[PDB]
Every structure is written in C-alpha cells, then in structure tokens.
C-alpha cells in the first residue's frame, strides 16, 4: 500500500469507481457523456491510475475534468501526466492553483521546507467554495476545506443504482503536519482554517466518504467487508464526522505539544 503501488480498481457505488493506488485515493465518476477524475496520486502512480481507468472499461480521452483535493506530491504528483493523457481541465481551490501549475508548494504551507516538488500541470483553473462542476448528468460540488493547504477542496456528489442514491464525499486531508521549524500556535490563519474545515466536513451530507489517504476511513477493511457484505460496507453516514473529529484531535494534540 505504497503511494505509487498498483491496486485493482473497483466500483464503490453506482458510477463512483476507485481507480487510485494501494496508498492514495483517486476516484473516477463516470457517465456516457464523459468522466470526472478526482486526484492523480503520485507521478509514478499516474501510470497505475491510467491503467485502472482503462480496466474499468473507460477511455482516457473521455475524462473531461481532473479535480484536485490539495497540491502535495502524493495526491497531485500524477495530475500533470493524467492531464496530458486525457486533455482534461484541472480544477482546484484558488490558492492551490499556482502550486499545481509549478509543482512547488509556497511558504504559507506548514510543511514548507520539507516538501518534495512534483510535475507542474497545464490547464489549471480555480473553483470557489460551493461551486458546481457539471459534465453531462454529473454534478460535483466544491467545498473549501483549507488548513492542510490554503486551497484544499473536498468534493461531493450523488451516485445512484436503480434510483437508490447515496451522498459521496471525496474528503481532503484535514491534518496538522509541518516542518520542524513551524509553530502552528504562531499562525492563526492556518489554525482558524483547519477549525472551519472540521466544522464544514462534520456537517456534510456524507453516506460514503472516500478519504484522500484511503485508510483514514478504513477503505481496505471496508473492501474486505464488502466481499460478503456488498457495497454497503463503504456506507457509513458518520464517516465525515469521524474524519473531522480525528482532524480536530490531531490539531489539539499539536497545540498542546507547542505550549511553553
Ligand atoms: O494528506 C495528508 O494528510 C498528509 C499527512 C501527513 C503528511 C503529509 C500529507 S500529504
Ligand atoms: Zn498533503
Ligand atoms: Zn497526503
């Protein structure tokens, strides 16, 4: 379950398919009129995502949008390659656009000093909080979830099977992590952003959460359950509340650790 590792793709519900690596989520939201890809995994992982999309019976040329959660190498490293293979437009939160274009995270990022660069992408455009991305019958909503990065987006949609529908959430990372030289307690905008994001995410309509790091919502345990349970194993309408609570716990632990 390395970030770049092969992983046999699988349908989670309706037209929502996991096409990521062993260690990093990527989702294809499919339609007869074209598809939306969420995240690219790593640079090496792009080749896994591409093969996975084809294994699910889809053409790369039919991927029209690539949606980015946030601009670190593990989620976004593969986007550039996937952009070239598909012709898609890359959509991201406003403050991460420049990072996706250059592959270099800026000094506002808590991890600045400790991050690895990744390949810059073409055709990057911004989306706002609450904005709808539409493609044929697909409708994906952008939710600003800053803190881990300034331009983090959590993406939501509905997938259905014979008219039985579920609210799906591709959850951005909400984690307080930094370089050794960074003090969260000195950066009130980042702390406030994280806290606002926990609150947004714990309020989302959230039947199926797919976390950018899949183990955050126990993807592999759930997949194992699904072998007998079916795809109800991925359903848990508390999952976004739990991802938010774990974010909050990580930040509170960190702020306590920083006290003089
Ligand atoms: O996505 C995360 O939550 C993350 C967490 C710790 C370190 C790096 C990252 S990229
Ligand atoms: Zn990250
Ligand atoms: Zn990550």
């Amino acid at each position: 379950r390395d970030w770049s590792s092969p992983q046999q793709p699988f349908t989670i519900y309706g037209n929502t398919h996991y096409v990521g690596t062993g260690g990093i989520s990527a989702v294809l939201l499919s339609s007869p009129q074209g598809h939306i890809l969420v995240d690219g995994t790593t640079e090496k992982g792009a080749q896994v995502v591409a093969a996975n999309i084809r294994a699910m019976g889809f053409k790369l040329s039919d991927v029209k949008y690539i949606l980015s959660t946030h601009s670190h190498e593990d989620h976004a490293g593969g986007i550039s390659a996937m952009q070239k293979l598909t012709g898609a437009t890359v959509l991201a939160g406003a403050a991460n656009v420049d990072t996706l274009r250059t592959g270099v995270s800026p000094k506002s990022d808590p991890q600045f000093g400790s991050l690895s660069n990744f390949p810059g992408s073409a055709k990057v455009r911004a989306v706002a909080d609450g904005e709808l991305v539409k493609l044929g019958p697909l409708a994906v909503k952008a939710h600003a979830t800053p803190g881990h990065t300034e331009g983090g987006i959590t993406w939501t949609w509905q997938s259905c099977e014979q008219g039985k529908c579920k609210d799906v959430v591709f959850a951005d990372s909400l984690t307080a992590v930094s370089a050794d030289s960074y003090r969260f307690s000195d950066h009130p905008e980042v702390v406030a952003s994280l806290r606002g994001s926990f609150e947004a995410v714990e309020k989302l309509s959230c039947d199926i959460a797919i976390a950018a790091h899949p183990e955050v919502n126990d993807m592999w345990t759930r997949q194992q359950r699904a072998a007998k349970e079916g795809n109800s194993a991925y359903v848990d309408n508390g999952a976004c509340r739990a991802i938010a609570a774990a974010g909050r716990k990580r930040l509170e632990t960190r702020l306590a650790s920083e006290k003089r």
Side-chain angles (χ1 to χ4, degrees):
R1 308 215 154 283
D2 163 280
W3 291 345
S4 297
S5 62
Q7 169 64 51
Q8 190 70 32
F10 55 96
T11 301
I12 286 169
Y13 194 80
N15 61 329
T16 294
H17 321 279
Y18 189 95
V19 294
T21 59
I24 302 286
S25 298
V27 160
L28 190 76
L29 183 64
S30 60
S31 93
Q33 302 187 345
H35 323 300
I36 298 175
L37 175 64
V38 187
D39 276 345
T41 82
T42 62
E43 178 178 5
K44 289 186 289 185
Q47 302 308 134
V48 170
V49 172
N52 286 346
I53 292 167
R54 292 191 299 270
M56 295 306 283
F58 299 114
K59 294 182 44 59
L60 300 187
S61 59
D62 286 333
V63 177
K64 302 312 180 183
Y65 290 106
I66 303 166
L67 312 186
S68 172
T69 53
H70 74 268
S71 48
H72 294 154
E73 67 177 321
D74 56 329
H75 311 280
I79 288 178
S80 182
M82 291 304 319
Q83 194 287 317
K84 287 173 290 110
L85 285 171
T86 59
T89 298
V90 178
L91 297 178
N96 285 358
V97 163
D98 190 60
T99 308
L100 290 177
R101 288 174 173 163
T102 64
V104 182
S105 288
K107 56 183 167 190
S108 65
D109 190 311
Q111 291 180 266
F112 183 88
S114 74
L115 291 161
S116 295
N117 299 342
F118 59 90
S121 182
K123 295 215 77 166
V124 187
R125 313 281 180 260
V127 295
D129 187 39
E131 181 175 331
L132 278 180
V133 179
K134 58 187 182 39
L135 179 68
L138 303 182
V140 176
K141 187 171 280 201
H143 305 262
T145 58
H148 183 83
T149 67
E150 284 187 358
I153 299 289
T154 290
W155 303 94
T156 63
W157 60 90
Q158 303 186 344
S159 286
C160 308
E161 291 180 2
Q162 293 276 325
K164 183 61 169 276
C165 299
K166 299 297 180 186
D167 296 323
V168 186
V169 177
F170 196 112
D172 192 22
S173 303
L174 303 182
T175 56
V177 51
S178 76
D180 284 344
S181 59
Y182 191 88
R183 189 168 192 265
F184 274 88
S185 300
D186 292 354
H187 292 91
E189 290 158 89
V190 167
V191 170
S193 284
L194 276 170
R195 288 175 173 167
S197 291
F198 309 145
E199 290 184 32
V201 169
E202 72 203 354
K203 287 175 195 294
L204 284 175
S205 305
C206 179
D207 296 304
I208 299 166
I210 298 148
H213 288 276
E215 73 288 347
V216 161
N217 186 32
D218 302 330
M219 176 67 75
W220 310 119
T221 300
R222 290 179 185 282
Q223 185 186 218
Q224 285 172 299
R225 286 168 60 210
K228 287 182 166 174
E229 153 128 33
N231 70 18
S232 55
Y234 302 115
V235 177
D236 171 1
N237 64 16
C240 293
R241 289 188 297 267
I243 295 168
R248 186 175 286 115
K249 169 171 303 304
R250 185 167 178 149
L251 175 59
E252 282 312 315
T253 296
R254 172 60 178 264
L255 294 176
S257 305
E258 294 186 339
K259 297 284 268 171
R260 267 285 187 140

